[PDB]
Symmetry: C2
Subunit: 103 residues, 2 copies
Amino acid sequence: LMGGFGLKHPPPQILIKNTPVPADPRSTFNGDKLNSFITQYSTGQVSVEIEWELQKENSKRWNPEIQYTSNYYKSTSVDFAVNTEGVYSEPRPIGTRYLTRNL
Amino acid sequence: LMGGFGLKHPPPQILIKNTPVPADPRSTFNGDKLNSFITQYSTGQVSVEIEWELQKENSKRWNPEIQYTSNYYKSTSVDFAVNTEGVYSEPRPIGTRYLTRNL
């Protein structure tokens, strides 16, 4: 109901964790669990690639369609770009429905 | 200079004419040319088919382009259609230059 593709078997969820590294323990045995660790974090790269299938539009409409376009007039900044501070923003929401079809 | 493709050998020009059909002449020979004809005209069908080669656009521009689009707002008639009297009109001239490229 938020929109999308419903899936019985959606793309699986991917879990990631840092392995705990203990700090130096006591030199005499204690049976309690170890609560003292070295502080860590990790960084890296992630890639994702999706193949999409397209359904081409085949239409005998004579007159031109409605299209999504960018504003022609001058502006202080470009839409869908960074500003002076280096912040990327998205000006408006963009839907999918422009071309037409007979009911 | 009006714009277009210059051609040393352009598509050839096609000439068409009704063949003259004489009206009944005199029953005694005269050597002057015949100036009296039957009035005629012709109608028919014509087809023309052109193959066009396309140059695809390959671009890394991040932000959206300018596109030619039709007006969204309500109107008394549709652009590029017939009116109530059956007259077809073209509202505006439409150029070819919308997508962009680096200089």
